[PDB]
Amino acid sequence: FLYX
Amino acid sequence: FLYX
Amino acid sequence: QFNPYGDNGGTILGIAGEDFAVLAGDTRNITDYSINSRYEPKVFDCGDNIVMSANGFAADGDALVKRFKNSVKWYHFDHNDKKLSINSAARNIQHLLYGKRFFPYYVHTIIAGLDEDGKGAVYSFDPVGSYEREQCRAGGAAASLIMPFLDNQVNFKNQYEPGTNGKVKKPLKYLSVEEVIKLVRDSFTSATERHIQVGDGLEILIVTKDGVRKEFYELKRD
């Protein structure tokens, strides 16, 4: 998934 | 490393 | 437990012309999410019109370049100042790399120069010394981003002659040093956008029969  |  | 390896990021790119070769590499050095240096060159003139870069784990990269440079020096002493041909250098590096087959140098190695016929040559090596002469090779973190672009623009892959019903391929031809440097600059700006370990600066070493020239270009610093 994506992270920030 | 590579394989063939 | 102590891990002897690390990843210093960055990416390198070698392209071979007709009577020249370029070896380009970004000047960014990183560990994890921290920038170590914005200008740490990893493309070196090793003499005898050979330029070399060992991208990946900088410690192993510097060690290898150092050992090869020393190998060139002792080649002169032992063989009456004879010039080390790019093909001979490539085989010598295989032996340096494979010497550590069971404790490998963690690097993707590219050398560039001229063959004994005066034509542009690029050799690329896997971490354990398997090597191959090519017109084109990207190495390091952003290799997977740049390489398919090079396939399309240098070797003209998947490109067919318009209106030939995809039957006649776009013909292979040598690129000018001007056209090659455009692709290198656009490869690195594209790589800088989409890869976090690539940016800061671009250093290109151009090899002609006249010798080794350098060019530097700014990249985005985020």
Add this chain to the structure above:
Amino acid sequence: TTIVGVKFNNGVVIAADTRSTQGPIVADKNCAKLHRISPKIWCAGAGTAADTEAVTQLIGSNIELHSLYTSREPRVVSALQMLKQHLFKYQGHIGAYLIVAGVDPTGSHLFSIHAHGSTDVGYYLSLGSGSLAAMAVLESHWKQDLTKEEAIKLASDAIQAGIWNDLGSGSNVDVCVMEIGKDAEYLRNYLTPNVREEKQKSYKFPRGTTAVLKESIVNICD
């Protein structure tokens, strides 16, 4: 990611970067990490991108229903209490690290929420991978009784520290200013210091370059 919150005399200001990443690759070059819980309660998210959006959207909904039921403008402590009770229930499995800020009848507020359900109070806060770069700037330049224009400058400077020095952070600076007795102003793309330089070359292909096997009209109508 680099999200900061700064308190000034008549309000609170939150700012965030615009970079979203999968592994080392940049998925979104310009993504908004500032979320509206309520018209005067805004939140900046770091950690699992999906989790931060979802948890903010869910509480934002429950706060609106609570506001309608009580015939009162929502309070920051309500959003905070509902968030930290929800996050605690899931024992950190919801990877949402939030800086909650807003104005309400009670006054101006600035909090930080962690995935495990812990909460902090402060005049200046920083969350995400670039927090240490941001907090360095905040610790160096922050003072008591900041003006609006000083707080925006400090907040955007703290984000910039992350953009340049942290690999996880980059691109632009989003800002939201929540001042008492005024509508909150969402300054999307307040700073765009990472504009892509003109490419060396247009890669617009001659029409017919791609080889085609079949064509067909697709029916989208009934």
Add this chain to the structure above:
Amino acid sequence: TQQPIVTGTSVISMKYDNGVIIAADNLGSYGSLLRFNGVERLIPVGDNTVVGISGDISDMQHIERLLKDLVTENAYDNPLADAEEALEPSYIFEYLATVMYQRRSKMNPLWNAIIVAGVQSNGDQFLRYVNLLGVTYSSPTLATGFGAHMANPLLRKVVDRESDIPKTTVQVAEEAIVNAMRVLYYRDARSSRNFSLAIIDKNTGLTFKKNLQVENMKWDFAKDIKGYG
């Protein structure tokens, strides 16, 4: 294969117009225990070099002995030991860099991050980093541990690239270093208030400053913080 026991935290450094500045706190941590408070982690070699060492202190004390022995060995059969054939920062660094990489390659590393700050015989600023992996890099600003995360961002606002070095004075540079040491004291849990600072200038030479303290600290705003909401 080691594990570090007694450790030193951030070493921070930067170049300015005429020379280099390096600083490091005087703490020897024993995990979370702040055990030793009289530890010097800046070790001068001659009058033109300072080696700043973080990481394991036992390995730091070993490196101290190697540098001490290097000065002795250099003086042997050397009439110009205090002139043309004196030890350069570049010589001292390359020696350590060789040792650090040899030790990692034998899977028995010196568990350290080292910054060699000095001025060459031709007046050039020398600043280069080496660690337990044998990784070497040079930059207008260098820092180890938490320094890399918090100091570098602040020091880079002063000297962002090479062209900024001639524009940076020793007053501005030293101020930036002392500010960085304060920020590290706020935010590093294995840092101390007491630190040493060294300036190697091509004109005034080596200036070693002991028993410095972090000061002008902002704590007043804490009185207004009650609970977590």
Add this chain to the structure above:
Amino acid sequence: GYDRALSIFSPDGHIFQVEYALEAVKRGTCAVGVKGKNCVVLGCERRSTLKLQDTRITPSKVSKIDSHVVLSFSGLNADSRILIEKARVEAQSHRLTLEDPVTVEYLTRYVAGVQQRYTQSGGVR
């Protein structure tokens, strides 16, 4: 280890220890080799000052190195056993790696190589 250079050059350019080794051969019982059109024959003298010998068990003058090669000699009997043993081992070693028995030239070249090594190795005659 014993290092002394026993085999060395003399002023006239002779290696006396090699030439004195030939005198030991000249003392040894006569051995003759005659190769025909489709065979080789190895003849060997046996001095007759030794009666009450047991010819069943007494080491035979001609030795098999492999099933297809033989070796006769003249000179010191004890020395011959060391050359024969080495040759027999090299014969099996060749079959193992080359998957083919030695040629007579190869087996000779090996034995000759061993004899040569002892003429410029320290501590050996």
Add this chain to the structure above:
Amino acid sequence: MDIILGIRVQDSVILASSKAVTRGISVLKDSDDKTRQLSPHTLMSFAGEAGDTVQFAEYIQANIQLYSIREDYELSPQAVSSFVRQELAKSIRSRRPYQVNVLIGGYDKKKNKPELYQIDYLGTKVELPYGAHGYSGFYTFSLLDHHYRPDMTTEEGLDLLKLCVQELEKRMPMDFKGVIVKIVDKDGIRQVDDF
């Protein structure tokens, strides 16, 4: 490697050895001879780890051939088996042991008797009327217990062996591509070409 059988009868020893050489999901060869002649009247079949099997077999073969030349004399099957066992007994406490299991079928010319020795990779030697290595034994031993007689002829021994191969082809999971059969007797070693 997998299936190696041995049956000592009245006047001979019979060694059957599977012909399949499998690696992964591919049968690379279906005509492999898993045996070496150590001396004119001594045969050794082998099965186990890839590479080790042949390397071990040829090493033993070389040593026995060297002894034969030196002494101009053939070592007894008992003597050869004892030598082979000691080599495996050394091997098991080496840095990398030979993972090779062998059957030594020989005819002792001095005693005028056939002899079958079963030696595993640990150096566990046993003289048997019939032997097997690997999973083969789990079928063949009970079958031979029933059908075997000590005074059988070479022809009876081959029929008894056919009964074993048939049972293995019926109940064994893997296709071992039949067997090469060899007979050791007073006249030396010869291969049965049609099995």
Add this chain to the structure above:
Amino acid sequence: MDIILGIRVQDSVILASSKAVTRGISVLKDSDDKTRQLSPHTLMSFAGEAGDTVQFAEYIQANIQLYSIREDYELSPQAVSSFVRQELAKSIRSRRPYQVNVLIGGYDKKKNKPELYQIDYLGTKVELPYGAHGYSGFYTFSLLDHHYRPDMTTEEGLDLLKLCVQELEKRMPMDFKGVIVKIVDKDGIRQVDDF
């Protein structure tokens, strides 16, 4: 379980399924039919985990037979395959998933066309001219790529299938004791007794 093949030709679908049921070092049975008739013109072959295979096959069979009675109508091969895929798609995120891989060979009476569906235990459905499951594919797919033509007769399809079984019997490590072959066409399902 192991080998299940399927070849869709002009006017029929042909399912070959290995007869061996192995457990440990023992082939327990050499005549096992790894197939169930779901409806008069729909056949499903299956391979995978012991117990799961038959339990799944019979469960599907019961559901399709129930539908047939309720509506007095035969579900299309496409409809049956979609139903089977959804059951496996449910299964994979269950507490204990069905570890069963299936081929559904059917003849659509409304379209007058043979249809072959390859569905793995994850619920990955594909319509193919020829399909295989397990290691079989690694040999048969390249072979069929070469020799297969879309307009082949049932007899040509059986010869093409014989070529697959021969290649598998040559190069496959395990003895799968031949195959049961069944043909699905406009006249329904029938078994080839001599293969």
Add this chain to the structure above:
Amino acid sequence: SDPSSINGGIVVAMTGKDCVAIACDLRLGSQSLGVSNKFEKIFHYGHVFLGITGLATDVTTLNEMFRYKTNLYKLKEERAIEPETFTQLVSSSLYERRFGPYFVGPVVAGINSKSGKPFIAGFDLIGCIDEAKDFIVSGTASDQLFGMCESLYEPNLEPEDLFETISQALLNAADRDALSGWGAVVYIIKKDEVVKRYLKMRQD
């Protein structure tokens, strides 16, 4: 046993001048073994197009699930779902399975029928929305696609030019990935006509 890279495959979407393009490879394999060269990863519900990479059983399941949901949407709303709305529905649906997710990399593409604006969006596996002006990439050769798109792409391409750019982006990316390729499909989407083209590419 990495669900996202068992079957393999890629989807790429791009925006042009009053048009969008979405393209995908046709490979479905079981790791090294190529199984199907007809497995399309792009579906559509009215004028809204969805491409799905990742585990093929989930690609099929989600297609059937969104058809189900867009059908009920249309019956109740008495109009076709718009790309912006559908994007939200995809996000909601994926995050509903937050602690047991569909191993997919979906990509929405289409033109809003009311505003006429070209729209593309990508999602992660847990349902985080990635909205983009230029392009969205997904699959086992996402790195390659990111490199190709970032260098080749330029804004406001005409439908016929956009076709060449997206096609060369997919083809050259797919040839540097083992688990992608084996044929490709490109949808060119205008306000009220859609062209679907099958590309010729190397079959290894």
Add this chain to the structure above:
Amino acid sequence: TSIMAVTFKDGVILGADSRTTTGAYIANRVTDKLTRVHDKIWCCRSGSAADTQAIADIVQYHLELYTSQYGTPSTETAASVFKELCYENKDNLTAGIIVAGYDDKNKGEVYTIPLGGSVHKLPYAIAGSGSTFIYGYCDKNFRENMSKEETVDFIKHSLSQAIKWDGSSGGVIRMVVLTAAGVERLIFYPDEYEQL
């Protein structure tokens, strides 16, 4: 973390540092680890910040609802509610809480609740990582029925040492005074306590 409660003549005093650390980084250097569960019942939070916050919130609710029905709860009652949560959820909690309150009948009381969820009523308590370094000091220096100024000095000197040796402890020394007079908050800055 360094926390302590000391019972003196006029009531009880709660003392704590202000440093919250994730690994070796300080997340908050001005934490308020002293929290209100009732008007004159306060607690000291050590261990998981998330867990100790969640617990504190539940008890305040319990004592608020207790007050609505049965009037002011005893300090023992508050400690009993803390224990009940800590003991029954011992497998999922990392929380060392010191409960300190002022009744008019019972005066100053201190209850310590370690990880186990056991209750220990003491004349004074110390907890958190920093406490280890001041067991020797606190034992030698503590006296019963101290004055307010003596108890403030005792806590200040104690936490001063705890802070000096513990990496996980630092920042300001917060204190809360519970007496019949009411509730008084105190703060002490590094520049004061460091050079004690």
Add this chain to the structure above:
Amino acid sequence: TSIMAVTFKDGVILGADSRTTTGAYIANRVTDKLTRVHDKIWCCRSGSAADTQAIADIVQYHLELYTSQYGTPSTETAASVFKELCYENKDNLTAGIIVAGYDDKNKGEVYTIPLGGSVHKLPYAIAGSGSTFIYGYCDKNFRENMSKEETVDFIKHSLSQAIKWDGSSGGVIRMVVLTAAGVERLIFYPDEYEQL
């Protein structure tokens, strides 16, 4: 284990407990953790008893052989030999040694050698499991140029607290006094130090 060395006006004093434990069982309740490496160079042994004994034996041999050739070694020389063994064999040693000696030139000196094998010259040192509890106490109470009686009390009170809180520390308090006068052994029994 609880050990400490304190430097005062007339020389140095070494102090230690007498408890050696395997797990929670006391193997020896009268251990002598103070050992002689030279006439006026002594050390304090903490960590693996086997490792610290083996090390101590080697150094005594080294300093005996040193004395045969070059006369009396300095306390620094002794600490250097200890360090050399501890540092070079850091992977195979669990030993925290405090080296304390009396020269006539240098007077009382204390060197502490933690697990790492680093050397730290200090006015006083504390080591072993029990030390943690008395960092606060020892820091507040230690003064330079104390008298013999003050230093004996300082060590007795310090180890008394260390023993009170540490399960691994107990028994008698042994002390060794190094001055120009000579070498004096002291012992203190529970019945005395417990009720300090």
Add this chain to the structure above:
Amino acid sequence: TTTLAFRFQGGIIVAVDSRATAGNWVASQTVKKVIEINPFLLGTMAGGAADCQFWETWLGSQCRLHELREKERISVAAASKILSNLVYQYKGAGLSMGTMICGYTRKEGPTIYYVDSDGTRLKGDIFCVGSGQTFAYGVLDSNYKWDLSVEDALYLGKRSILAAAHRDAYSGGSVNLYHVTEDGWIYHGNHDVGELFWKVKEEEGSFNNVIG
């Protein structure tokens, strides 16, 4: 990788693919997987690129020293056994090589030896080695006869690599053909699968699974 060599009336046919991979990443599609040891000796490479390349190059040095020392070209058996004895010394080290030693000599005739890194050495008439060995075997075995012509044998060898190049995700690039006779090895060109597939599909009428 996919490599095959088979023996027939006309001599030995050696066909190899040209692709090298690191995981699912295609590193190169232009690799020489056949080494020309000498005019009558060929070496095939599968497994670790470095291992095969380095040790087969090294073998060529050992084969040269043999003919200097023995004034005679090394046998295929001896050449294969130098390599098999070498890798056996490294057994357990983690060398990954699957190689075929193909050559002609007077005493042997045309000979193929399979040599792998766990020390297996097999003489045989047909071998396929690589990730797509099974795909190659499928086509080769089903079409193989001893009486194939040099033209047909060359095609079958080419078609068998193409078959594997198609189905196997980790095989492709181009087909490199060799023909070993009594007069030595003869190179029969590099054939890109890009063009070869469509050329074969059209002319042969095969590959009906693919959208034409």
